[PDB]
Amino acid sequence: ASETFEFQAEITQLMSLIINTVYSNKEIFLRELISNASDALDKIRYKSLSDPKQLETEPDLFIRITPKPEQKVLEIRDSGIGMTKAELINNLGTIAKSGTKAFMEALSAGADVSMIGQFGVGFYSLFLVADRVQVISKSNDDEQYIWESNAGGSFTVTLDEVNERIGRGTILRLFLKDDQLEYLEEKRIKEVIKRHSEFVAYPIQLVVTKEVE
Amino acid sequence: ASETFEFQAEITQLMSLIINTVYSNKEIFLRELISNASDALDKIRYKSLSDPKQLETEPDLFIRITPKPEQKVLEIRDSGIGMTKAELINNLGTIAKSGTKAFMEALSAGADVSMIGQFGVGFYSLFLVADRVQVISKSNDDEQYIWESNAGGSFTVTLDEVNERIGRGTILRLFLKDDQLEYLEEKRIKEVIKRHSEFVAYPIQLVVTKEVE
Numbered sequence: 001a002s003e004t005f006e007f008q009a010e011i012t013q014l015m016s017l018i019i020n021t022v023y024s025n026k027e028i029f030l031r032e033l034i035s036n037a038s039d040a041l042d043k044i045r046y047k048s049l050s051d052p053k054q055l056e057t058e059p060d061l062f063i064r065i066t067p068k069p070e071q072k073v074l075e076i077r078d079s080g081i082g083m084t085k086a087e088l089i090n091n092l093g094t095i096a097k098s099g100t101k102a103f104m105e106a107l108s109a110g111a112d113v114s115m116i117g118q119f120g121v122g123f124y125s126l127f128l129v130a131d132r133v134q135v136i137s138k139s140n141d142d143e144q145y146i147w148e149s150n151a152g153g154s155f156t157v158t159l160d161e162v163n164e165r166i167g168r169g170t171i172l173r174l175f176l177k178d179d180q181l182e183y184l185e186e187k188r189i190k191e192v193i194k195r196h197s198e199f200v201a202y203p204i205q206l207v208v209t210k211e212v213e
Numbered sequence: 214a215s216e217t218f219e220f221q222a223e224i225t226q227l228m229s230l231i232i233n234t235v236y237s238n239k240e241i242f243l244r245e246l247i248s249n250a251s252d253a254l255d256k257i258r259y260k261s262l263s264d265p266k267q268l269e270t271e272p273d274l275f276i277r278i279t280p281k282p283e284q285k286v287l288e289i290r291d292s293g294i295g296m297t298k299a300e301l302i303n304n305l306g307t308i309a310k311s312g313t314k315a316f317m318e319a320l321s322a323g324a325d326v327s328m329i330g331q332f333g334v335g336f337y338s339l340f341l342v343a344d345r346v347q348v349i350s351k352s353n354d355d356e357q358y359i360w361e362s363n364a365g366g367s368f369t370v371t372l373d374e375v376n377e378r379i380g381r382g383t384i385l386r387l388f389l390k391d392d393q394l395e396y397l398e399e400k401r402i403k404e405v406i407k408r409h410s411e412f413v414a415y416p417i418q419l420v421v422t423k424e425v426e
């Protein structure tokens with residue numbers, strides 16, 4: 001029925017630094033979320049070694065990118081390990097994150113945004129291209145939940161009685177900024193993926209809507 | 214929380230005649246559901262003439278066909294008028310339907326299955342290719358509901374706390390028979406649509422998943 005949570009202070013700062021920022025190489029947000037997806041797919045594949053039944057909820061391991069042009073939305077789905085309510089809460093904003101400080105200090109010094117991934121806060125690069133995100137997620141150990149943020153000071157978390165059922169995993173639902181609609185285009189997606197996500201152990205799927213004529 | 218309803222007797226007979234049937238031209242089920250979609254799109258476009266706000270819930274008028282190969286499922290979506298709980302109940306199985314009798318008598322006499330559409334029971338041709346259907350629907354005048362049938366003697370109707378939100382309209386979710394998986398293939402869909410659905414006033418979209426390599 002949907003709870004509101006406060007962002008740890010530094011995490012709010014990080015998000016502002018990013019959402020309010022010029023910078024050409026915004027395309028990196030795609031490497032970052034594909035990198036996350038991949039990590040999440042590794043984790044369930046590995047968990048499944050001693051627990052084969054964990055795969056039963058969704059046998060197929062993939063990454064799938066669905067531009068929804070109509071809604072100015074882009075979605076990155078993975079059939080990875082997914083995240084519980086508690087995980088969404090703790091890992092995505094309430095708890096003091098590993099390198100949020102360190103990363104901003106590095107930016108102060110002239111570091112390239114590109115590095116965000118190496119500080120373990122790559123997730124937040126999605127604010128380069130988006131003013132709202134929903135992380136929708138289904139872990140084998142909990143119900144499906146939606147974490148939502150507009151880069152403000154808080155996020156909500158809501159039991160998901162609204163989205164298609166993910167069997168297991170996570171959909172990143174990016175509400176793209178108006179200047180950033182190029183990331184809805186098939187050719188632009190293939191380009192970024194080919195150039196900067198060359199070594200991914202899982203198939204990357206791209207959902208394309210074509211009018212039959 | 215999901216109610217069970219009985220099929221009017223003749224409607225049960227019709228469904229058996231169809232689901233238990235040889236016959237080459239099964240492809241007609243596609244004409245029939247595209248024909249329905251179109252009718253449903255006409256109806257809201259027309260309703261919108263004196264009530265422009267009816268379009269607000271989903272401004273775009275389209276038909277969209279999404280083969281889900283993984284789940285052996287094919288979906289035909291329309292952004293048409295959609296159907297209420299009561300409508301799903303009355304119009305799709307509990308009430309004595311216009312030409313269900315007449316149509317079966319016509320089949321007894323040697324009529325081609327193709328004609329089902331002209332008896333106003335084309336909907337049931339989907340059992341040519343499918344052993345389970347979910348009709349999921351969102352009318353402007355009610356919540357989203359799922360009507361479900363395996364061709365048996367009954368259907369259920371359930372408040373939809375499980376599927377993506379249709380803004381307005383209907384998704385036909387066909388669980389294809391194992392002999393009928395050709396209707397998952399892009400080329401097969403374009404063929405049937407081009408040959409037998411040549412004159413449709415609305416764009417027909419086909420969702421294709423392609424692996425980026």
Ligand SMILES: COC1=C2C[C@@H](C)C[C@H](OC)[C@H](O)[C@H](C)/C=C(\C)[C@@H](OC(N)=O)[C@@H](OC)/C=C\C=C(/C)C(=O)NC(=C(c3ccco3)C1=O)C2=O
Nearest residue numbers: 035036037039040080082083087091120121122123124170
């Ligand atoms: C040491 O674990 C890792 C953490 C610490 C926890 C958050 C891990 C999570 O706990 C529940 C969980 O184990 C998930 C698998 C989470 C993943 C990676 C993502 O979700 C999925 N499923 O797509 C992502 O939301 C999309 C979640 C937040 C990640 C943020 C903050 C990051 O920028 N980076 C990050 C990692 C990483 C991997 C590759 C590049 O960076 C990473 O390995 C981490 O922060």
Ligand SMILES: COC1=C2C[C@@H](C)C[C@H](OC)[C@H](O)[C@H](C)/C=C(\C)[C@@H](OC(N)=O)[C@@H](OC)/C=C\C=C(/C)C(=O)NC(=C(c3ccco3)C1=O)C2=O
Nearest residue numbers: 248249250252253293295296300304333334335336337383
């Ligand atoms: C005189 O209205 C019509 C009826 C009688 C009522 C059912 C109408 C419905 O009441 C609420 C409603 O007005 C919807 C718009 C329903 C549509 C057409 C479909 O849903 C959508 N939205 O895709 C379909 O489920 C997919 C529903 C059942 C239809 C069956 C039984 C049919 O085989 N045929 C059929 C028509 C038809 C049109 C073209 C070819 O055949 C038709 O015009 C009819 O039965």
Ligand code: NI
Nearest residue numbers: 070071272273
């Ligand atoms: Ni539009």
Ligand code: NI
Nearest residue numbers: 131176177178
């Ligand atoms: Ni916007």
Ligand code: NI
Nearest residue numbers: 027192195196
């Ligand atoms: Ni580049």
Ligand code: NI
Nearest residue numbers: 059060283284
């Ligand atoms: Ni499979």
Ligand code: NI
Nearest residue numbers: 344389390391
């Ligand atoms: Ni089956």
Ligand code: NI
Nearest residue numbers: 240405408409
């Ligand atoms: Ni033909």
